[PDB]
Enzyme design. Sequence first.
Site, PDB file in Angstrom:
ATOM      1  N   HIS B  41       0.807  -1.217   0.000  1.00 16.21           N
ATOM      2  CA  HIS B  41       0.000   0.000   0.000  1.00 16.21           C
ATOM      3  C   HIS B  41       0.857   1.292   0.000  1.00 16.21           C
ATOM      4  CE1 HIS B  41      -0.042  -0.326   4.505  1.00 16.21           C
ATOM      5  NE2 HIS B  41       0.037   1.005   4.432  1.00 16.21           N
ATOM      6  N   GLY B 143       2.164   6.003  10.227  1.00 16.59           N
ATOM      7  CA  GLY B 143       3.586   6.013   9.894  1.00 16.59           C
ATOM      8  C   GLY B 143       4.326   4.754  10.349  1.00 16.59           C
ATOM      9  N   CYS B 145       3.504   1.614   9.567  1.00 14.85           N
ATOM     10  CA  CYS B 145       3.425   0.481   8.640  1.00 14.85           C
ATOM     11  C   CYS B 145       4.780   0.061   8.124  1.00 14.85           C
ATOM     12  CB  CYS B 145       2.440   0.747   7.517  1.00 14.85           C
ATOM     13  SG  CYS B 145       0.759   1.018   8.120  1.00 14.85           S
TER      14      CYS B 145
HETATM   15  C1  LIG Z   1      -7.142   3.573  11.576  1.00 16.05           C
HETATM   16  N1  LIG Z   1      -6.982   3.661  10.135  1.00 16.05           N
HETATM   17  C2  LIG Z   1      -7.348   4.748   9.465  1.00 16.05           C
HETATM   18  O1  LIG Z   1      -7.873   5.721   9.992  1.00 16.05           O
HETATM   19  C3  LIG Z   1      -7.089   4.798   7.980  1.00 16.05           C
HETATM   20  N2  LIG Z   1      -6.332   3.685   7.339  1.00 16.05           N
HETATM   21  C4  LIG Z   1      -4.920   3.949   7.054  1.00 16.05           C
HETATM   22  C5  LIG Z   1      -4.047   2.671   7.166  1.00 16.05           C
HETATM   23  C6  LIG Z   1      -2.567   2.951   6.811  1.00 16.05           C
HETATM   24  C7  LIG Z   1      -1.983   3.471   8.124  1.00 16.05           C
HETATM   25  N3  LIG Z   1      -2.797   2.793   9.149  1.00 16.05           N
HETATM   26  C8  LIG Z   1      -2.391   2.715  10.521  1.00 16.05           C
HETATM   27  C9  LIG Z   1      -1.638   1.654  11.023  1.00 16.05           C
HETATM   28  N4  LIG Z   1      -1.311   1.484  12.314  1.00 16.05           N
HETATM   29  C10 LIG Z   1      -1.729   2.404  13.174  1.00 16.05           C
HETATM   30  C11 LIG Z   1      -2.506   3.539  12.816  1.00 16.05           C
HETATM   31  C12 LIG Z   1      -2.967   4.491  13.759  1.00 16.05           C
HETATM   32  C13 LIG Z   1      -3.712   5.564  13.362  1.00 16.05           C
HETATM   33  C14 LIG Z   1      -4.040   5.739  12.021  1.00 16.05           C
HETATM   34  C15 LIG Z   1      -3.621   4.840  11.080  1.00 16.05           C
HETATM   35  C16 LIG Z   1      -2.843   3.707  11.442  1.00 16.05           C
HETATM   36  C17 LIG Z   1      -3.961   2.294   8.648  1.00 16.05           C
HETATM   37  O2  LIG Z   1      -4.803   1.686   9.284  1.00 16.05           O
HETATM   38  C18 LIG Z   1      -4.705   1.567   6.350  1.00 16.05           C
HETATM   39  C19 LIG Z   1      -3.950   0.598   5.693  1.00 16.05           C
HETATM   40  C20 LIG Z   1      -4.599  -0.446   5.063  1.00 16.05           C
HETATM   41 CL1  LIG Z   1      -3.647  -1.709   4.332  1.00 16.05          CL
HETATM   42  C21 LIG Z   1      -5.976  -0.540   5.036  1.00 16.05           C
HETATM   43  C22 LIG Z   1      -6.731   0.430   5.671  1.00 16.05           C
HETATM   44  C23 LIG Z   1      -6.106   1.488   6.334  1.00 16.05           C
HETATM   45  C24 LIG Z   1      -6.941   2.517   6.984  1.00 16.05           C
HETATM   46  O3  LIG Z   1      -8.130   2.335   7.188  1.00 16.05           O
HETATM   47  C25 LIG Z   1      -6.894   6.173   7.397  1.00 16.05           C
HETATM   48  C26 LIG Z   1      -8.166   5.438   7.146  1.00 16.05           C
END
Ligand SMILES: CNC(=O)C1(N2C[C@]3(CCN(c4cncc5ccccc45)C3=O)c3cc(Cl)ccc3C2=O)CC1
Lengths: 305, 306
Positions: B41, B143, B145
């Site tokens: 991603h 950040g 990931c």
């Molecule tokens: C909580 N997530 C989000 O608000 C969002 N999100 C983004 C994301 C990438 C980064 N990321 C996070 C990873 N670990 C911690 C996190 C903490 C707080 C924000 C994000 C974080 C993700 O989850 C993502 C990756 C994939 Cl492969 C599939 C979906 C998502 C996704 O839904 C923005 C919409």
Amino acid sequence: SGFRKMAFPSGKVEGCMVQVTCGTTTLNGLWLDDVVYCPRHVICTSEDMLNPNYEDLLIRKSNHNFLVQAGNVQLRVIGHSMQNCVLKLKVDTANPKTPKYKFVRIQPGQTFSVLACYNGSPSGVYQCAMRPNFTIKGSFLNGSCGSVGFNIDYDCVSFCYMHHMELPTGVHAGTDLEGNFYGPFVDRQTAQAAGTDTTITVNVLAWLYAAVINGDRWFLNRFTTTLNDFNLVAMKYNYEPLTQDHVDILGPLSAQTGIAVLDMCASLKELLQNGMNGRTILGSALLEDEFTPFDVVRQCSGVTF
Amino acid sequence: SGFRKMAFPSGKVEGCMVQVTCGTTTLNGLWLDDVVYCPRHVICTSEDMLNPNYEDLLIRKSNHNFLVQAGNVQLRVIGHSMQNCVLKLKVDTANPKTPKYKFVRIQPGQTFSVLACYNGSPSGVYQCAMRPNFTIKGSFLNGSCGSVGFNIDYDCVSFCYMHHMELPTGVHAGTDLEGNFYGPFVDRQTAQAAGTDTTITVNVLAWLYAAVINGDRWFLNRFTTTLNDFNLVAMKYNYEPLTQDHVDILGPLSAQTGIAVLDMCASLKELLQNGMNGRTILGSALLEDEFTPFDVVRQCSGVTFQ
Ligand SMILES: CNC(=O)C1(N2C[C@]3(CCN(c4cncc5ccccc45)C3=O)c3cc(Cl)ccc3C2=O)CC1
Ligand SMILES: CNC(=O)C1(N2C[C@]3(CCN(c4cncc5ccccc45)C3=O)c3cc(Cl)ccc3C2=O)CC1
Ligand SMILES: [Cl-]
């Protein structure tokens, strides 16, 4: 999201761990520049430990009596001296992996990471706090002496603890890197005990702020208190007194969450008086006190090293 | 004595962390030999995340669209390929700090250390377990990931997890190092949720054995149980079923303490019925389930405090 007991990355410290052997005693040493630091009890037999005269034991040793091993390489000891309860072995090679470092003495309530070591080899890393009674609730077996505690600030390692012994209650005692013990302990096998401990109030408040930041708010209430009334309640439950310095230190968290420090103190008073009523805070049924205000801000901001 | 949530020393993994950037998106990568592994991603903008067509997004990229930074040095990408949900970037420099390593896919209940990273720089290390619902209760911010999970039994690093996303309950989902997700999750912003989780029974029993080794027996009782009657009770408390494999795995801890597995199961049944009545076990007021039988043997003394 999430909140874990997090240690600093241990790599800069792993590159400093060596094995020190004097006769039948093998323990760990910290190799920085051309000096290896280790507990002075490495020169003691079990009988010597009953009542040691470290100067008299040391005068009978030559530089070659100290075997220092760094990985699979033997380091040549070219000098030795004692500083308080630490032995300093001068070696003929400066550690090429010596990080930028300082020796710092910490106060009760402060946390640090421990790199548990055996035979000069790191085995694990965990987070500890210096208890108000100057002991640490570590996880250490025989052979762990010389393992160190530290914090990191940017690229600088601040070494604050060197492991020396385990007390009868299974808690641990040691020194700063200048060989000064934390607590009223001595490096001798004579009757010693951990004193009655207390809970680190400022850290419990920091962890309640971490819970609010993460979405656990059930314990919040409409009430506030004064510092004096709060301290009467803290004394009653064996909690450390909260000072105006602790209130000031929690300022940023009070501003981010909108919960004043004395507003959070009113939540803590109710928790002490009523319990959790079957509920948990950040996955715990006890009030956690081994996260400082700085640890909470750091984990909720992603500071790197 | 003592018993802490203990992570492996992170040094061998710190020397592999890099930053990967594609346009405005940046995350962490793992640099081993001449390959950098990262979540696929990294090629998506926020606008692509609902139904990304990774094959169509990737074909539009050249090697020079990927910026890889190791410390303060830019690595040169000379090849790229996608394997499941990970991207593999071939670089022109082999990592001189590559440790001895393996890629291992773990099962629910297994534990591992996580080296949380931001912008290719390590921030902290903590222990985690793969929950029965295939999520991990991590501590991760935006950040993070590309941060990895690993074990270092006997000087070889076994990488088992790469971080991809956070679910609505604040728990985390990711893949093994071959890009296969743990759990029924996808790397899409479509509606997803963690399933109902359960407690890892074999790990709670291992931790009760750790408490006996460390000198505490207050929770034991005069009773025993059959495996089936134990499972019938435990499931009423949302505990995972205990299998004959779990009983076999607990054999060494049973031999060291002299407490038969089914006798420790009877103690656990009673703790679930009564609670702790103001007492603690290894400094906890809850039954801990993120220490495996192997972790207990690794950390505890080989001599019980009788
Ligand atoms: C909580 N997530 C989000 O608000 C969002 N999100 C983004 C994301 C990438 C980064 N990321 C996070 C990873 N670990 C911690 C996190 C903490 C707080 C924000 C994000 C974080 C993700 O989850 C993502 C990756 C994939 Cl492969 C599939 C979906 C998502 C996704 O839904 C923005 C919409
Ligand atoms: C519990 N300790 C002991 O049974 C003995 N002991 C030994 C020792 C050195 C090692 N060591 C330990 C350090 N951390 C953990 C431990 C676990 C289990 C055994 C030992 C451990 C010590 O405490 C020591 C050092 C100093 Cl400076 C002063 C006295 C002692 C001491 O009393 C043997 C008698
Ligand atoms: Cl596994």
